[PDB]
From a paper:
Prohibitin complexes are dome-like structures consisting of prohibitin -1 and -2 heterodimers that assemble in the IMS via their N-terminal transmembrane helix. Prohibitin-1 and -2 (PHB1 and PHB2) are members of the Stomatin/prohibitin/flotillin/HflKC (SPFH) protein family. Among other proposed functions, the prohibitin complex supports cristae architecture and negatively regulates the activity of the matrix-resident AAA protease (m-AAA), which cleaves numerous matrix and IM proteins. Three-dimensional (3D) subclassification of the subtomogram averages revealed two distinct conformational states of the prohibitin complex present in untreated and OA-treated cells, both of which resolved to approximately 20 Å.
A second conformational state became evident from 3D classification of the subtomogram averages. We refer to this state as the open conformation, because density is absent for approximately 25% of the side of the wall of the dome. In the open conformation, prohibitin 1 to 2 heterodimers are arranged in an asymmetric spiral that are flexed outward by 2° relative to the closed conformation. The open complex is also roughly 20 nm in diameter and protrudes 8 nm from the IMM. In the open state, density is missing for the SPFH domains from 3 heterodimer pairs. The density quality and resolution are lower for the open state, and it seems likely that the open state density reflects an ensemble of related open states rather than a single unique conformation, as highlighted in Movie S5. The closed conformation manifests additional density extending 3 nm on the matrix side of the IMM, while the open complex is associated with minimal matrix density. Quantification of the two populations of complexes revealed a statistically significant shift from 75 open to 56% open after depolarization, indicating that the prohibitin complex is basally in a dynamic assembly of states and that depolarization drives the complex toward closure. On the basis of its two distinct conformational states, we propose that in untreated cells where prohibitin complexes are more open in confirmation, the open state is “active” and allows access of the m-AAA to its import substrates for processing. Here, we found that like HFLC/K, prohibitin adopts both a closed nearly symmetric structure as well as an open asymmetric conformation.
Author numbering:
A (entry chain C), B (entry chain A), C (entry chain E): 191 to 299
D (entry chain B), E (entry chain D), F (entry chain X), G (entry chain F): 177 to 272
Write the structure that this text describes.
Amino acid sequence: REYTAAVEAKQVAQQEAQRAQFLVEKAKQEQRQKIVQAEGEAEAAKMLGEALSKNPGYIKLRKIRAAQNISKTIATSQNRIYLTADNLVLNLQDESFTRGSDSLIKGKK
Amino acid sequence: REYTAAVEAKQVAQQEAQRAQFLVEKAKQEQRQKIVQAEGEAEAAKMLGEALSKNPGYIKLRKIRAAQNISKTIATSQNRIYLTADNLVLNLQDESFTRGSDSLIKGKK
Amino acid sequence: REYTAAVEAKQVAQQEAQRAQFLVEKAKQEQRQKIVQAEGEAEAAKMLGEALSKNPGYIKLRKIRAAQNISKTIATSQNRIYLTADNLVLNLQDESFTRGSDSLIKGKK
Amino acid sequence: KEFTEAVEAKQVAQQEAERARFVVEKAEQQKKAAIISAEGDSKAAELIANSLATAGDGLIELRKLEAAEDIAYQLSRSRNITYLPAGQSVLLQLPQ
Amino acid sequence: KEFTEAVEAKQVAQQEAERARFVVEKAEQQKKAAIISAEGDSKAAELIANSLATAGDGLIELRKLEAAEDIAYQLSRSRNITYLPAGQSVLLQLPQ
Amino acid sequence: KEFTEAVEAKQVAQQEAERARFVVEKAEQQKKAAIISAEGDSKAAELIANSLATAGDGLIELRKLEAAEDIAYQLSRSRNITYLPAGQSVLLQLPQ
Amino acid sequence: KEFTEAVEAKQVAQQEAERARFVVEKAEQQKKAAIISAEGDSKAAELIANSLATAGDGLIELRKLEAAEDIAYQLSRSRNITYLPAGQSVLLQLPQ
């Protein structure tokens, strides 16, 4: 079973070493394609880095809008979870109520 | 199957690269459409900063009103979020009653 | 049972020990085969080490993007998990909010 | 079975390698498209960033408050969502 | 029975040994090709690493925010997953 | 048979392209009108923001009261109500 | 019963002594064979350590992470897996 199988495997492995350098080429083309897919991801990466790493203005607002896209997606989310209480600062009558978001005075944030 | 598919896909790929420049135009248009969704968001942003970076007043008041609205739709929310003891002070008799209600003092807010 | 079994074992073992030095050879070729499969892996590894060891830019973004890939997979996941909720940092009214994504300023990440 | 399959794979792979040179071209074009769409999103975002940086954190927090209504709106289409205060020593113990 | 089995194994070992020497050569070609698919991925990764090192952590955090939406999208196709604070004395429990 | 279906899908994509042309125009229009619908709701916000930056939270005190009556009737539906502490090292076990 | 069995064990144990002589002649060879298959694994590994030392933790990390796609592909056939943050007072519990 494995004797003729291995001999034919050696011959087809000559053929497939030729076709495996050919795979170098073809999967190189699919490599550029997948590079380019994850590099549209990466151009999102660049764009957002240059835009919002100097100072996260919309990365602040995207902590926000993407915690809310996460929690516009928490519908699927059976997930038990825990945010923090001083996050939603449901501390309405508190000293640290607007320690949470008088951090709007930049420096606390 | 993948041979005829590949060749037809190469010809369709030439015509679809032309249509892909057309797609670049169409996606600049979608660029504008989502630019503007979050730029109505951003009109809110630019003005809310100019009116609150002075001192977060509607942001104080909108932590309060977003806590109120968060409660308000916690009503329909099954969420086993909570609050806890002693800020909305319903230790209705307490110093903390004058440290959650007198927490409204500026400096403590 | 064990007498004839042992005698046939010894004879079959003479020819099988010839066959098993021959297995040193055979398993050596399988050795190099497994070597080169996990070397596709390994030189992907060398290349990624030049990609990332210099600076964990995509090590950071891939902690996170593998988070999201692992997550697209955690669809099937039952695995009961945690965050540190200051990881997405959904801290939707908080100072620690803009400590999570003022880590955008390189150095805290 | 691997001989004819290997020959057809080589032929299909040459067709796909030329088609994939043109698909790397298509990928540059489709990335113009995807960059510009994800940047519909993200250029809306950068103009929001400019608004919040020049004006301050106004709607940083106020879409952290308006969209914080989304928390109470949308947390418990499931049944186990909640939170836990910080600056403290919480004994976190997730529900069952 | 082990007699014929082991002799057949000897002949199979000869053919597999020569086979596998050339499988190692074909695997030099295929290691290049697999490095190349992993290059699709990993070279997207080189350009991402360069992009983020040059431009800070924008999408380090914004695939931690934008594609963190994936976390809510996916975490819960089962019913016992969660995400939960720290920076405290959190004394985690996990459920039945 | 499947060729007709594939051509139909291609035509559907082309019709989405036309719809996106008219989304171009709709995008011009809500440029104007979404910027300024913001302007409206948002200037309710401008002045409340200034009024309060000067003094502090005035209207959801009175409307903790008024919106208590009304939408905290819409909260007297909220089955589980508790009321948080803070300013101390608060530590918690919570509902399952 | 143990008289005939004892005599049989006597003779068969001497035969197994000689069979041991050549079973670990065979097992000089079989130690080598198993050594060498595990060496295929472990020399993929020697040069993997070489690749990730001459280059670094790139894919020491990313065949954690690209392979964490596999973490999630493989874990979930089970239904009680977890991963829970450090920097806390975790009293980690387990499900039922």
